[PDB]
Design a protein around this ligand. Structure first.
Ligand SMILES: O=C(O)CNC(=O)C(=O)O
Ligand SMILES: [Fe+3]
Ligand SMILES: [Zn+2]
Ligand SMILES: [Zn+2]
Ligand SMILES: [Zn+2]
Length: 413
DNA sequence: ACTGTCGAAGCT
DNA sequence: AGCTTCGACAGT
């Protein structure tokens, strides 16, 4: 382990890791997942995806989906995406790259967080600028152009910093982990309470469904408690980002800690909260370097064709649409209409773009540090009534000092 | 052989 | 409120 080859050419077989789960064959994965979830059979659905290393993107460089994995029934509880490693016959020949639990949190609590975060971030939220907010040319308008309504990212908790090679709060007497506009401690505590309670609720589910990644993240819980979220023993998270109609361009989260993962809690607008329903718009979570198999979990071609026809796997087609492009790139230190298209991505069967359509209250686990990932731009982004809110829970690298690493930094004298 | 990042404190 | 120090790394 391993001897199937003599070097790991990730650029071809894809990134290799096992802390979400690994096994000799797809059947093995099902055994693991049935045991973890505590449910055999139809509750669990496994989709083979294939690493192609060729990125699906629009003519302007923005995210697109080529296939959508959709919840097949109310009977489906757990979605797993597995990669069969090209040219391997060992005990980690198949690995888990994504876990999605459809019924992640209580719907009543999801409904509430939707209202409360939308209202709170609206009024007091100070947005966090991220590289993945723009395409590579830095001229797209995927978030919308109205500053008041555009899709945005709001980051809370602790973050790693290059200046300190540690927590950004190295020099902070009393850190404000849930900092809002100006200074309004009653709103900030209200936000905190919501996100701490949510951190607390999700950690047990993280442990249950991805033990090894979870255990990696709590190794230093008692050494750096100031850089952890959560209200109870077992605190895998350190940072949390809220994304409101935010189009995250293809990226990896480089600052995240090695051998961890990301948990994403999804909240949707009220028109998209029933199974099978027909929402005006919809945001997808995409893995641009993968394609779907010709075959289902158990090896059948016909079973996989049924899913394509039922819609459990939606095969999308090329599209021409108009989008705006800034006259001048966004820096760091007016616009025109342009025809965007995806024909090229769709022409090549090996250009990727496997997407999932995460539901209200669902929880998605992936190794965002390793896998390229993206979210699709909304037709009409409006963070005042967003089509989708995602709450992304993570822990950065080198967050293992007490007191946000205060002593270690003052020691650098 | 360059670029660019889920920043905040202290002084002015 | 603006101007300054603080600098680890993956990508290309
Ligand atoms: O919102 C999602 O589904 C995924 N989000 C991200 O990758 C991010 O904010 O970095
Ligand atoms: Fe990400
Ligand atoms: Zn874009
Ligand atoms: Zn092998
Ligand atoms: Zn911290």
């Amino acid at each position: 382990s391993c001897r199937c080859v003599e070097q790991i050419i990730e650029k071809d077989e894809g990134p290799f890791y096992t802390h979400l789960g690994a096994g000799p064959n797809v059947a093995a994965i099902r055994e693991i997942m049935e045991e973890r979830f505590g449910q055999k059979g139809k509750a669990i659905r496994i989709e083979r995806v294939i690493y192609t290393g060729k990125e699906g993107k629009s003519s302007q460089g923005c995210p697109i989906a080529k296939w959508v994995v959709r919840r097949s029934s109310s009977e489906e509880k757990l979605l797993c995406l597995v990669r069969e490693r090209a040219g391997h016959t060992c005990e980690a020949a198949v690995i888990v790259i994504l876990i999605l639990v459809w019924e992640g949190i209580p719907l009543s609590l999801a409904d509430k967080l939707y209202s409360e975060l939308t209202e709170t971030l609206r009024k007091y939220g100070t947005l966090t600028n991220r590289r993945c907010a723009l395409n590579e040319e830095r001229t797209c308008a995927c978030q919308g152009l109205d500053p008041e309504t555009c899709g945005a990212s709001f980051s809370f908790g602790c973050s790693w910093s290059m200046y300190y090679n540690g927590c950004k709060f190295a020099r902070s007497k009393i850190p404000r982990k849930f900092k809002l506009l100006g200074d309004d401690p009653k709103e900030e505590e209200k936000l905190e309470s919501h996100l701490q309670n949510l951190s607390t609720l999700m950690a047990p589910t993280y442990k249950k469904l991805a033990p090894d990644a979870y255990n990696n993240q709590i190794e230093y819980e008692h050494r750096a408690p100031e850089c952890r979220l959560g209200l109870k023993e077992g605190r895998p998270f350190s940072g949390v980002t809220a994304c409101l109609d935010f189009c995250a361009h293809a990226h990896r989260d480089l600052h995240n800690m090695q051998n961890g993962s990301t948990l994403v809690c999804t909240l949707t607008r009220e028109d998209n909260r029933e199974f099978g329903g027909k929402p005006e718009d919809e945001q997808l979570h995409v893995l641009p370097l993968y394609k779907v198999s010709d075959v289902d979990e158990f090896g059948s071609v016909e079973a996989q064709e049924e899913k394509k026809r039922s819609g459990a796997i939606q095969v999308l087609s090329s599209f021409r649409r108009k989008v705006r492009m800034l006259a001048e790139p966004v820096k760091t230190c007016g616009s025109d209409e342009v025809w965007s298209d995806s024909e090229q991505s769709f022409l090549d069967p090996d250009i990727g773009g496997v997407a999932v359509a995460p539901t209200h209250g669902s929880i998605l686990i992936e190794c965002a540090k390793r896998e390229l990932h993206a979210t699709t731009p909304l037709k009409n982004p409006n963070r005042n009534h967003p089509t989708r809110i995602s709450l992304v829970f993570y822990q950065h690298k080198s967050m293992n000092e007490p007191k946000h690493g205060l002593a270690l930094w003052e020691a650098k004298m």
